[PDB]
Ligand binder design. Sequence first.
Ligand SMILES: NC(=O)c1ccc[n+]([C@@H]2O[C@H](COP(=O)([O-])OP(=O)(O)OC[C@H]3O[C@@H](n4cnc5c(N)ncnc54)[C@H](O)[C@@H]3O)[C@@H](O)[C@H]2O)c1
Ligand SMILES: NC(=O)c1ccc[n+]([C@@H]2O[C@H](COP(=O)([O-])OP(=O)(O)OC[C@H]3O[C@@H](n4cnc5c(N)ncnc54)[C@H](O)[C@@H]3O)[C@@H](O)[C@H]2O)c1
Lengths: 336, 335
Amino acid sequence: NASKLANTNVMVVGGAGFVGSNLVKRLLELGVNQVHVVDNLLSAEKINVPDHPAVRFSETSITDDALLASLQDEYDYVFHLATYHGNQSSIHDPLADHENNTLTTLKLYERLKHFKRLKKVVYSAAGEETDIVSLHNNDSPYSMSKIFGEFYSVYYHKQHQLPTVRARFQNVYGPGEILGAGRWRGTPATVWRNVTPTFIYKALKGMPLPLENGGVATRDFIFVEDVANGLIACAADGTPGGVYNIASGKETSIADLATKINEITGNNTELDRLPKRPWDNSGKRFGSPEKARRELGFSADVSIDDGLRKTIEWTKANLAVIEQIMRKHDSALATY
Amino acid sequence: ASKLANTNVMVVGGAGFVGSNLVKRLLELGVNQVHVVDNLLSAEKINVPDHPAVRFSETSITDDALLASLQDEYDYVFHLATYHGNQSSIHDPLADHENNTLTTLKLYERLKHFKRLKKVVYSAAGEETDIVSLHNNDSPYSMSKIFGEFYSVYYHKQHQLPTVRARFQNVYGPGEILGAGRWRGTPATVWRNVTPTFIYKALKGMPLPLENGGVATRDFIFVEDVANGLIACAADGTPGGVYNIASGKETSIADLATKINEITGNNTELDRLPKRPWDNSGKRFGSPEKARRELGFSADVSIDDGLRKTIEWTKANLAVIEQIMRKHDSALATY
Ligand SMILES: NC(=O)c1ccc[n+]([C@@H]2O[C@H](COP(=O)([O-])OP(=O)(O)OC[C@H]3O[C@@H](n4cnc5c(N)ncnc54)[C@H](O)[C@@H]3O)[C@@H](O)[C@H]2O)c1
Ligand SMILES: NC(=O)c1ccc[n+]([C@@H]2O[C@H](COP(=O)([O-])OP(=O)(O)OC[C@H]3O[C@@H](n4cnc5c(N)ncnc54)[C@H](O)[C@@H]3O)[C@@H](O)[C@H]2O)c1
């Protein structure tokens, strides 16, 4: 049913970003009529927005009142991917997080509530689906903002029939995640965004991979192209008011991540890994991909090896530009 | 309670119903100073006493200049501001967010630097658990109240802000003024809650608009008990903790109406129906046992006594209450 999006008008809030740019690429592949990207480039690079006849780019916050007022009821689908990137940035400035991570969703939904052409509004939430949450689980304002967007998604559906679908995912990696993308957001994580691109960049430079705690921790990585397809499946076939895990169902240890990256890149430097013991990942739960498979026919099948090969090829091909982007934060990094 | 003697206290939302009662009790307790911060969005200035120990900032707590001007000179902060209430919030979720979610966040973001604070008490909505459903929330107001609990837990864990969440519901008593504040979009601005609506109507000798035979029950709690409960939270509540401040006693709306009529001498009819098992089934009231055990707090004002006090206050102030109600006449007529 991904062809349901053929010849439709789509908005992608946060569409200049990592997941967003990949979603935009896939929408254009599927033959959408128009993509309206709304993105303030707070954590993104304009090089991730194509200069394409189906792509309209509004370089403005989705909280901007004038922008919101200017929106017309001409969208079939909306993908809400904006966030304040990410955990560490949000701890550093909870008010910057609120503006770009909680208020975004509320103001977007308040404008959309009277749009009648809307078939689905897909919200990227953070990471068997249950709708019970703990007040204690939340390590950052980012994590609270993500949860709050689910509260809003449920409310706008119940009260106003906004056809929301919540897509939960975690540990996305792949082409288009640029270290240093966007503005300085307070901490070194602006540069070193996530473990996979940090390790790829370091391995391409022939640097030893800074492996923490022997790399015993595991993550369910998911390739960004699979996430894009999962978000599309939610739009086309997800139940309004509903939620879906968009997940690989496969765990990789950080040590094995490092090893694969080193092997593919030919980075012949040491790795300080340790054997996993029963106490190392004992509490850990990963999201089941079963609901999305059963109800949407969606399966995230790109293997970690194939995904890493693609990501590494893209990173190598763009290494100079990535480095120019990272370097803009040299001063802020030095004084942190 | 006397732990607060001679302390400096801030009451955000201190001009409102619960707030004004809390401020009165704090003064009785002999606090050094109360700083009330209130934009009067749902409140009346006559609920702010002229008293040498009260300072009044007629300003939103989200105002940056006000926040920046605050100094680390408070022993206790009571955060009572909200966007009153469910109905208003549904009408305008953005007005709610500004006065109900953003309030908490910006307040906490300022206070996290303050090391004189012993306790920060947040009035949340109604054994205590910290698990919530994404589905339980009928309104933006409801979401904002829950969000404030999330923030309270976070700021304690991350920044050691000594928060205590106080959960209550169905407060009634002197100082709740029908029509208080600005028009917030719906007739609930006037007809705020069932108790003051019924008291007012009974005093005017009008039939009480009892809905569905009054089979619904509520755990009403008298406002002075809520104020003492908040104080017990401040003095002795565990940082990061939560306590139900509750009566543990249910009254049907039909019995509420009957009592109000009996006290006021309102001789008009009442359409009551008998309560059946399927009428309140599964409705849960908050246990007051944790607050009793840990803080020695119990809410002992009976419904009969509280209603008497409330009716007396209303009768005493009926003229001013009506003048306050009447400012919303045009807005009511067009709703
Ligand atoms: N990458 C992951 O592993 C991961 C995991 C779980 C959930 N998510 C969610 O997926 C979404 C996309 O994340 P990402 O990894 O692509 O990060 P990203 O930072 O690359 O993308 C987010 C985009 O939002 C934009 N933005 C920020 N504030 C805005 C505002 N006020 N108005 C409009 N646009 C704004 C940024 O400039 C950026 O382009 C986010 O909602 C994120 O929380 C991501
Ligand atoms: N009355 C009840 O039965 C009840 C039940 C459960 C929880 N509560 C909570 O108790 C607290 C007090 O409620 P109340 O019944 O006294 O209502 P209220 O409306 O009388 O008091 C709230 C006060 O907050 C003020 N306020 C609004 N926005 C503000 C802002 N931006 N900055 C500063 N002040 C602002 C209002 O002007 C008002 O004086 C609220 O937090 C409410 O959610 C009340």
